Structure 1
Amino acid sequence: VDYDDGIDFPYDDPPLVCCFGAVQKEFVPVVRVHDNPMHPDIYSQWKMLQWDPPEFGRAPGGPPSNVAISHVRLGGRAAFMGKVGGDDYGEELVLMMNKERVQTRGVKFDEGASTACTRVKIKFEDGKMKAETVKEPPEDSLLASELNLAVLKEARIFHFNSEVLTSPTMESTLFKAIQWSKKFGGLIFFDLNLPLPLWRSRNETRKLIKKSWDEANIIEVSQQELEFLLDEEYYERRRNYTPQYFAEDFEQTKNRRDYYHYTPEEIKPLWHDDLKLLVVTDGTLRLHYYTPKFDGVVVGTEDVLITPFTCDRTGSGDAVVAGIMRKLTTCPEMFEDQDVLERQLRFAVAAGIISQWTIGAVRGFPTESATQNLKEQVYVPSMW
């Protein structure tokens, strides 16, 4: 807006990344309707949905603090920008991030608020129960004057989710943070992770995210989010088509799973000038990538049935994003070299796979050497 902040410094390696939003424990934001529910009380059956998940939950994302923790464990450096209350739960969240060696100088305390607590009022409009927000939680109440500009000056990637778009206060604060980061040369990473309200209608969501979509240099979306934003019914019809008499080629006879790679012309409504990399994730199975110059897909895999009693997919979406951010900062040729980009994205695939082998997102985030080991075990040496 006006000037700089802090003292210019040689800025130790690896380059810092900043994660913006709400620090929460667990809290899966992406919620849709699944048609295969287990017993409502016997939660010992619910693990069967971890190894036959709904498609929107194949590699779930989470709060931005998950990405920061996962990024640090993968060998990077990260700082979290956000607000917590001055109560005991607020200290626990900060102590969790300090233990994981995430910088918390960008975390502001609000001594008059209770962490993760929203005051709402219950109404009975048209014979139905609804709630409306009376006072937002401290997590969604960071002000622009409370931004740590030293972090925004140092950080090379600014990362945020669409959960901040559900808060009037955070949305205004978000666009001041983006302005500062761009002024200092930072790249903007938009990890969509649509919360429950934003799944209601395509047109309302497209209007709501359009401004933040246009400010982003890197975007990660799931296959379900991308199809919802373009046309959900066209792609479902496309998946359900079966030739009447004979297959068009030998591969169509095998009745394999659909890994459709969207053409850059289908993606065109969502492309803009400043966008450097679009990644569409089909869990860890496929990573479709799109650049101004080229596009392609990285083939991955998953194995949660290798450990049926400890598998938990929560947080695996954050590990994939953290793995992308770890390689983008240290391998800047990823943006311009296709072969280099594919090799580096296989590192992100491996991180997602390991993350699904432990109960709890933070508890199961993998280290760099474990991720590198799994990548070399899974892929043939020519693909490393």
Structure 2
Amino acid sequence: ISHTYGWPPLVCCFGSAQHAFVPSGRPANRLLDYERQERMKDAVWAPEKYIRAPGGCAGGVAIALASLGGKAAFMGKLGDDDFGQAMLYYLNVCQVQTRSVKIDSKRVTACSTMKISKRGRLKSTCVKPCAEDSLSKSEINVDVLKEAKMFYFTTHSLLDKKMMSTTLQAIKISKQLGNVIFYDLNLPLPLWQSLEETKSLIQEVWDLADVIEVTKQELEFLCGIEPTEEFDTKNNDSSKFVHYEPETVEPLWHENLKILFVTNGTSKIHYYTKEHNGAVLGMEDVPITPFTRDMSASGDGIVAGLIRMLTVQPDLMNDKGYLERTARYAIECGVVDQWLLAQTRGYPPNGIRSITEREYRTSKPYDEPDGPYVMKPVEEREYRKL
């Protein structure tokens, strides 16, 4: 039925469809005009410590890709409960294809049964996994993989051993059908300790990936580079944004790897091919609120932008000019998505209370009768002598 396949090529995003879920957060440096920040400090919210999250779940990337005019299908499992059906509704309205979504009447969305040990130090040892960890190999939609030209997945699908085998099966099937494999690291919280565990866990999927995207912090962690630059200092020194030479990332290279993308938020995106390497400057002075401070919207927007460009010109995966254009397009997509999320969520003042940025920048009258800015009676005046 390849005569029925349209344009752009379908992209299969594989994993979990969570709601406002963050895998991890690392200290980061962003490009910023600190003269403006001092002038606007009383009106522009900034975090005390800038910590950036790599991104979100596979579901958010599918939603972001559909917003760019792409064609995205989400492959995963949701429960038949109300929350699972609400998430399925949200994906369909965002025009993500959910024919590859398995609805499980036996499993529960976003809830896992753990057996907490009360003998020594506390341990958890999950017993009954949630709905978005129980996709089986028999439940893989091979029809979606046949149409899809790119297969997207993240490390979160490798955490559960049952779910890891399904991810490996889906990847192997996709490679047989000539799909490009896009591996977005987005390293989950437990894996940031014991680098040796991380290498063993991701080694098999790493060698099967044609395109890999990592953050600058993730690249340093996998390469055994201890962070040496400063954090949260009011300058834009080039040591905070260093383009590593290709020899530094060679130990992570493998035979079938086409492109390696290294992200530093929307501030800077680095790219590495077998022949070419380079970097593109961006902009990360976007409106940020306490509800959006982890910058996970940018990460999903960046990856969606990369996927959109790589899929419409798949033969230009080694053209240096197209790579620079692709990196700049991803930066713009991340900036817009972060900017939109600030407007949607707003500021702190299901009981959830939010105010607009107009209300956030509204000061108090200072009309206190005891206060020094109003007209007191003639008694307490103290007319300041000229």
Distance apart, 1:310 and its partner CA? 7.9
Report what 1:224 is aligned to.
217
Structure 1 Cα separation of the partners of residues 328 and 246 of structure 2: 22
User: 1:18 is matched by which residue type in structure 2?
Assistant: C
Return the match for 2:74 from 80, 87, 92.
80
Partner secondary structure for residue 131 of structure 1:
coil
Distance apart, 1:363 and its partner CA? 7.8
Report what 1:322 is aligned to.
304
Distance apart, 1:358 and its partner CA? 3.5
Unpaired runs of at least 5, structure 1: 1-6, 35-46, 241-252, 365-384
Structure 2 Cα separation of the partners of residues 12 and 168 of structure 1: 36
Unpaired runs of at least 5, structure 2: 29-44, 347-386
Structure 2 Cα separation of the partners of residues 254 and 267 of structure 1: 24
Return the match for 1:214 from 186, 196, 207.
207
CA contact (8 A) 1:15 1:155 kept: yes
Report what 2:106 is aligned to.
112
Structure 2 Cα separation of the partners of residues 15 and 357 of structure 1: 28
Report what 1:16 is aligned to.
10
Rate the CA distance shift 1:204–1:52 in 2: closer, same or farther, 3 A: same
Return the match for 1:195 from 188, 209, 227.
188
Structure 2 Cα separation of the partners of residues 213 and 125 of structure 1: 38
User: 2:306 is matched by which residue type in structure 1?
Assistant: I
Report what 1:146 is aligned to.
139
CA contact (8 A) 1:80 1:104 kept: yes
Report what 1:41 is aligned to.
none
CA contact (8 A) 1:60 1:317 kept: yes
Partner secondary structure for residue 297 of structure 1:
strand
Sequence identity percentage:
46
User: 2:162 is matched by which residue type in structure 1?
Assistant: T
Partner secondary structure for residue 83 of structure 1:
strand
CA contact (8 A) 2:26 2:217 kept: no
Aligned residues: 327
Rate the CA distance shift 1:140–1:339 in 2: closer, same or farther, 3 A: same
Distance apart, 1:53 and its partner CA? 1.8
CA contact (8 A) 1:81 1:104 kept: yes
Q: Deviations over 1:197-255 (max 9, x none)?
A: 1111111101110001011000000000110111132xx24x36xxxxxxxxxxxx994
Return the match for 1:263 from 235, 240, 245.
245
Equivalences for 1:114-129 in 2 at 5 Å? 114-126=108-120, 128-129=121-122
Equivalences for 1:334-345 in 2 at 5 Å? 334-345=316-327
Superposed CA RMSD: 2.6
Partner secondary structure for residue 153 of structure 1:
helix
Asked if 1:177 corresponds to 2:170, the answer is yes
Equivalences for 1:343-382 in 2 at 5 Å? 343-359=325-341
User: 2:89 is matched by which residue type in structure 1?
Assistant: L
Partner secondary structure for residue 30 of structure 1:
coil
Report what 2:377 is aligned to.
none
Instruction: Say which structure is richer in helix.
Output: 1
Report what 2:366 is aligned to.
none
Q: Deviations over 1:139-178 (max 9, x none)?
A: 0110000010110001011000000111111111111111
Asked if 1:67 corresponds to 2:65, the answer is no
TM-score, normalised via structure 2 length: 0.79
Rate the CA distance shift 1:289–1:267 in 2: closer, same or farther, 3 A: same
Report what 1:295 is aligned to.
277
CA contact (8 A) 2:289 2:342 kept: no
Partner secondary structure for residue 279 of structure 1:
strand
Distance apart, 1:349 and its partner CA? 0.4
CA contact (8 A) 2:59 2:74 kept: yes
User: 2:272 is matched by which residue type in structure 1?
Assistant: Y
Partner secondary structure for residue 130 of structure 1:
coil
Q: Deviations over 1:172-199 (max 9, x none)?
A: 1111111111111100000000111111
CA contact (8 A) 2:298 2:335 kept: yes
Q: Deviations over 1:94-131 (max 9, x none)?
A: 100000110000000110111110000111353x2221
Rate the CA distance shift 1:263–1:256 in 2: closer, same or farther, 3 A: closer
CA contact (8 A) 2:16 2:133 kept: yes
User: 1:104 is matched by which residue type in structure 2?
Assistant: T
Structure 1 Cα separation of the partners of residues 49 and 104 of structure 2: 42
Asked if 1:53 corresponds to 2:54, the answer is no
Report what 1:249 is aligned to.
none
Structure 2 Cα separation of the partners of residues 331 and 363 of structure 1: 35
Distance apart, 1:86 and its partner CA? 0.9
Structure 1 Cα separation of the partners of residues 339 and 208 of structure 2: 35
Partner secondary structure for residue 166 of structure 2:
helix
Rate the CA distance shift 1:118–1:105 in 2: closer, same or farther, 3 A: same
CA contact (8 A) 1:287 1:299 kept: yes
Asked if 1:284 corresponds to 2:259, the answer is no
Structure 2 Cα separation of the partners of residues 177 and 333 of structure 1: 24
Structure 1 Cα separation of the partners of residues 171 and 328 of structure 2: 29
CA contact (8 A) 1:16 1:77 kept: yes
User: 2:211 is matched by which residue type in structure 1?
Assistant: I
